[PDB]
Enzyme design. Structure first.
Site, short mmCIF file in Angstrom:
data_model
loop_
_atom_site.label_atom_id
_atom_site.label_comp_id
_atom_site.label_asym_id
_atom_site.label_seq_id
_atom_site.Cartn_x
_atom_site.Cartn_y
_atom_site.Cartn_z
N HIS C 65 0.84 -1.22 0.00
CA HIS C 65 0.00 0.00 0.00
C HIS C 65 0.85 1.24 0.00
CE1 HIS C 65 -3.48 -2.43 0.97
NE2 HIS C 65 -4.07 -1.45 0.23
N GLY C 109 -0.16 -5.35 1.21
CA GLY C 109 -1.12 -5.49 0.11
C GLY C 109 -0.56 -6.29 -1.06
N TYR C 139 -7.58 -4.82 8.53
CA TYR C 139 -7.67 -5.51 7.23
C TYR C 139 -9.10 -6.03 7.07
CZ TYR C 139 -4.85 -6.60 3.22
OH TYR C 139 -4.31 -6.59 1.95
#
Ligand code: KGA
Ligand code: KGA
Ligand code: KGA
Ligand code: KGA
Ligand code: KGA
Ligand code: KGA
Ligand code: KGA
Ligand code: KGA
Ligand code: K
Ligand code: NI
Ligand code: NI
Ligand code: NI
Lengths: 260, 260, 260, 260, 260, 260
Positions: C65, C109, C139
């Site tokens: 991310h 991610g 998450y």
């Protein structure tokens, strides 16, 4: 007795040996119907554990789906009462443990059949492959589900997308197999474990087996999703590629897949 | 303080140590009530990670179900509010990580208890068995479900159908354990990992743990399937085999199971 | 032509190479939108297998991310239409196998993104970390589910609760990876397997992949359970700790998490 | 006692009367908190049935959601722990029957509230409307589900899409109400039934109520479908129409909705 | 011939008439065994529709579950093999429509039995009661589910919590009955509709009946939910109140329930 | 413009009128394709509510399936991408209310089509029949499910097993219809309701309609159950009765069904 299996009983353990060498134990209807009758005949209180095996020394355990019977002309060849579908259900519902004792090469449908059994003990030289993508066969949801309870998704997708054989050592490492042993020890090792299981409480074994069967099956979806998948499978059965895959297998040539 | 456990806090890590060694940490109601009270008392912002252990040098981590405390027959032995069923729910819903630090042998209900925890770190000499088929016990659905999220179905079936112990090395290979270490390094290795986890974001750990719990339980079935299973379980806990298994254990002899 | 990826097709195989090294292939919206446009452009009958890779010699496969794009002011950073959530759906629905070919370190991610793909083949020097507990991120259920189909629950909980990197050798042992090879063999090994898959029946591969996708998602729960989880996730994204986690990452310091 | 409710106990029946007539028994947090406290305080073995009512003569039974309490910046006012979500769970989980005894007009969230209760007995002059489409509110999944267990889908869609009031007579005809009586008979009719229920087996009533609650909630979906719906809800909360709907209610004017 | 039913065939319609008037057609094991044997005997291609009826002029259609055959306490009274549980499954799975033709009063299990059938056509003087809360019996999930597919939740809860009889006219209005007719017209009205159904395609009727049965049962929950419910049911069948309910029935007096 | 429908817009309301009278608005592919194109074209922000209707004075609203469009025998006419299956999905997913305004008789698949819409407003002279048992058609799961959300199970089975028409007045009483109007008032009553709905918040209507759709679909089952139903449906499509039913309808004679 049976035309296509041989049964031996040793105290509480029954051994069902395949006797369909003329087609290398391909899952023809006449062979599966004898296997199912032999299992049914063994559903008695004094039998506690079943072993499924090919004859001693076999290079082929089972050649998998009988492609001469696997129908073309738009019909689903993995319908609910097709023989492989019937025998996996019967193995999974059987109130005694069923051990697959594997010597030789295991192909396609026969791989799903041993995967549906409770334990797999294999010779160090045994090999394993899952082959529908070789023929263009849209394998059914239940059949694919039966391959997802031991190895992870990435491993299962490699086996199905490549159709490549794996060794017994790799099958052990990824969780498909219980035990790998030298072929000269295979029978002794498997019988010792089957006799040991047969000393345990059969009603507890049967209910825990059934609890595992229903938890294994308890992946639920709505009617629309199932009908959407069946529409996709029918398009595959209707494709030029499916005709090409079946014909290429029967003609022993490499198929030419074109994506319609 | 507690009669049947000892608790030590080291910075943000709490170690709950069993103190029921005269019964080899069998899961008697009095022991489990103390373990649940100790866990509840540690549900505090300054505590970040829990370790469950037996005393240093234990030969038996836990002998599993207290067979004296099972109801003798006609009664479900694994009802929702039985102590093992309560502690596994409490471990699973606890908003901090719980690490089972295992030295010694692990039996039956105690194997389910550690499987319900978040991580298992074990001594190279530890052994693991799941034993209900030794006694004829119809293990309950939730209980069996708790054994299916680490190793594959064939492996779990071998463990349950044979009731044979596996080594720490094999438990590691099939996916039951996180780590195997020499016994002399077990406390230091596990404390180092718990202190590490203790610096991470506790609210993120708690919601991810809860998401995994819900996903792990999200195998759903209809009421008829559940009631059909319960009817099968009742036939087992009504059976002469169940009484014979309980009796043979208390009398220290080999049971003779007959299938009713 | 794409600003953030490079595509080479030979015969039936397409390689999508990241071209975002100046930000360590962080999952910025501009990079994910280019990856998704490149996949959509490759959804053609003559393309049969996709490889995703970082450039040769990459130390970092993907930094995960983009922390400069994660919503701060009370907004879910993993909502259904966030770019990571979109790409994982697109990969899973894509009617051709997608192989992650991994050189370098994989973070957060990006670990979820490769787990969503069909096969993973990695260099022996590659490493894998799941990092939300480093930032205090709750998450989402779909994202966590994507991490649970390969390795067992205890392993997944170690990876998430520690945020500690694991080697390619351990990732292979626990069932996350298909193959580990010396980095100098990585492209040749992956191309050989991708070209092999491209000779198989594409319509059978597509329907079997979709059957696996549906079965993998078929962990169902009632509306109350989902709304309960949503409420827990909202309390995490409203948390002091969530702000501290983002702030620490921006200020290049260690977060001090306090449990609100 | 309670600021915002009045409680009368007649033998085994407790009558909870709203005391917030100043604000037409709008579902303000302070009112709902007192209603939940009074209900909790009545969870005792000697109480067997609950009646919820507005004061005798009330023109408005309840005006539904308090607008002055919806916290803008988009924040979901139908989140898991908002007062109306808490009181519907508490009513449905309450181990005694709860009868809504309705005099006056019932609006929006108060309609959901009485639908969540076990039986509804109403005055011939009472009226019922479901109002979120007047304000542009994306009503939540659990809240909508609470409206679907009595009348059929077409009827529920008419009630929600029109936000038009229906008569007691029509509510009886479509299966929302148990009984419609003249207002002068409402207390006699309701108390006679509550007293009759109070002579029945309370533990049987409790477990059957809980069986109905779980069967009513047992409409299950995967995580992806929940996250998709949540995305659509968020888009409505972020809309210009939602601001217009709330501003128009506060300014006592007709909203002009434009579809963004 | 059968000891406890009499069977008439009129063209393609079979009428099964209860002959157990000495216990008012209470659902004793031996009565249900003959009803099931008569259904099995009629499962032939030349039979196309079944009517269940009490004898002409019967005051009591059926007095419901045989209370004498319920266990004394400590045992589940509505286990999967109980006669009522067997007959409802058999009616639901039977591949021909089964019409309940009702003259006289219908009680408890007999009300669940007619609800499980495909159509109900009743005399204008017939009445309907659901009575487990009179005895303190914890009805099972499947049994309760069988009552929820016709009338709404508020109506079902009124019927069960009050155990008060409703008229044929009210049972029509709320969706329980298909038709109400004067008793002199009941037999020939029912036969005219059964003959009309008997001219339609029987394989189509059978697969549509089965699709409706599967859809009706497709309310799914996780194992923990079911085991939580089962524990609550066990607390009821272990209660003082259950004993009091059974004793009050035996001594023909009003029970005194106390909530333990 | 469209060959087979006529569209009129009155500010925010669109009226789609059938123009296929010479074939009694039978559900031919060319007619459904035009209805779907006309809906797609009305999926615009300034349109808020759709009305489906037959022309003023129609004796037959729709004759249902075009029997002259049965595909090659041994083949499912209710497969996922068949036109009736496509338009019911499209109506249910359409983000605006769709009102069926019914004048004339409604048959078979046309009954399923209006049941899939959001509200039904009908002429006092309109009639409704569900006809697959007349022909021996194994109506598909999704299709049957679409008939179960308004009237109860006993009512639906009477409709399907009898294939008998019911009046508008009985369709209102059992919960199928919203309103019954004199034919001269039908158009104005329906337009005033559509204009009223068009003043409400469209994004709120869309998300609540979608939440009702997914709750209505959320009846879940496992793969084995779906494949078992598909096997039964195929056996019906393969039957002599299925041939007899289609031939009888084509030849305008009474079928002779024999149950194979
Ligand atoms: C579920 C699924 C499948 O199971 O697909 C089928 C997968 N099976 C295979 O690909 C293996 C097919 N067979 C082979 O490749 C070879 O027979 C192998 C196993 C390597 C052995 O070679 P071999 O030289 O020793 O023996 P063969 O002479 O090839 O075979 C011995 C005999 O068995 C027949 N046979 C072998 N496999 C068969 C099969 N799958 N179906 C039908 N007949 C088969 C073959 O035609 C020959 O019969 P006949 O004498 O009447 O001509 N699927 O498609 O997903
Ligand atoms: O290298 P690779 O193993 O990935 O290559 P593949 O072609 O996938 O597989 C190597 C060979 O093993 C064959 N094979 C497939 N399944 C098999 C199994 N279960 N056991 C042994 N061989 C098998 C496959 O048909 C191929 O045959 P052939 O060379 O006669 O065409
Ligand atoms: C799932 C499930 C279970 O959990 O069943 C139980 C599984 N556990 C077992 O089978 C192991 C039982 N115990 C043993 O086998 C032996 O104690 C082992 C572990 C080998 C160690 O032998 P040991 O010689 O060193 O010590 P012991 O004297 O046997 O045991 C030390 C003390 O603990 C007692 N004890 C041991 N196991 C017990 C158990 N499961 N329940 C109750 N008491 C137990 C034992 O009676 C003795 O008490 P006392 O001195 O008052 O007689 N199940 O069956 O359903
Ligand atoms: O030989 P094996 O290991 O394959 O199988 P088993 O006979 O089942 O098991 C070997 C022995 O280990 C015992 N055992 C069971 N669970 C155990 C565990 N978790 N740790 C250590 N021993 C265990 C088992 O009771 C048996 O003892 P005993 O021989 O006194 O009965
Ligand atoms: O947390 C989100 C996902 N997980 C991650 O940890 C992402 C980054 N994590 C890391 O451990 C390191 O950044 C890794 C990937 C090993 C790279 O280490 P490195 O030795 O090559 O160099 P770094 O100093 O860490 O990184 C080089 C620069 O890229 C920035 N960067 C790295 N990852 C980033 C990310 N996911 N989002 C935004 N910026 C990032 C980093 O903040 C630093 O800041 P700046 O622009 O001010 O110079
Ligand atoms: O008129 P109608 O019945 O066709 O439908 P509506 O226009 O929605 O409703 C008619 C009026 O009754 C109001 N109303 C809504 N729900 C109501 C209820 N439960 N009881 C009484 N009036 C209500 C609605 O707000 C509207 O207000 P107003 O007259 O101020 O606009
Ligand atoms: O759950 C269980 C559902 N069943 C019930 O609650 C209804 C049980 N019974 C009643 O309500 C009444 O018996 C009804 C059915 C209205 C009939 O009243 P009645 O006054 O005409 O006749 P009874 O004399 O009460 O009943 C005739 C005989 O059948 C017996 N009986 C009635 N219902 C019974 C039942 N459900 N199970 C066992 N026996 C029953 C009753 O105890 C009596 O026995 P005995 O001859 O030994 O005294
Ligand atoms: O089976 C699906 C459900 N449909 C039906 O039951 C069939 C519909 N028709 C009837 O039931 C009746 O004929 C009804 C609907 C009342 C129509 O009134 P009617 O009797 O005056 O009109 P019909 O005589 O049926 O005749 C009108 C024409 O349209 C034809 N037709 C009617 N329904 C049809 C259908 N579902 N598909 C194809 N053609 C159809 C019919 O066969 C005739 O064709 P042809 O000119 O080739 O003979
Ligand atoms: K309080
Ligand atoms: Ni699963
Ligand atoms: Ni005996
Ligand atoms: Ni439902």
């Amino acid at each position: 007795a049976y035309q296509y299996v041989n049964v031996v009983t040793i105290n509480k353990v029954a051994v069902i040996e395949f006797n369909y060498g003329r087609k290398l134990n391909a899952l023809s209807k006449v062979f599966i119907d004898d296997l199912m009758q032999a299992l049914s005949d063994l559903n008695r209180p004094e039998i506690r554990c079943i072993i499924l095996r090919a004859p001693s020394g076999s290079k082929v355990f089972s050649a998998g789906h009988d492609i001469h019977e696997l129908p073309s002309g738009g019909r689903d060849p993995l319908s609910y009462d097709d023989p492989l579908r019937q025998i996996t259900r019967m193995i999974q519902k059987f109130p005694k443990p069923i051990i697959s004792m594997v010597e030789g090469s295991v192909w396609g449908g026969a791989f799903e059949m041993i995967m549906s059994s409770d334990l797999i003990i294999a010779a160090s030289t045994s090999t394993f492959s899952m082959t529908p993508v070789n023929l263009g066969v849209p394998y059914n949801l239940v059949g694919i589900h039966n391959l997802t309870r031991d190895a992870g998704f990435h491993i299962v997708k490699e086996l199905i997308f490549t159709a490549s054989p794996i060794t017994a050592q790799r099958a052990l490492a990824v969780g498909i197999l219980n035990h790998v042993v030298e072929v000269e020890e295979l029978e002794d090792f498997t019988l010792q474990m089957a006799h040991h299981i047969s000393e345990k409480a059969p009603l507890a074994i049967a209910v825990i087996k059934e609890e595992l069967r229903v938890l294994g099956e308890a992946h639920t979806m709505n009617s629309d999703e199932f009908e959407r998948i069946q529409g996709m499978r029918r398009a595959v059965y209707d494709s030029e590629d499916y005709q090409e895959g079946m014909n290429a297998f029967l003609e022993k040539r490499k198929p030419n897949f074109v994506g319609h």
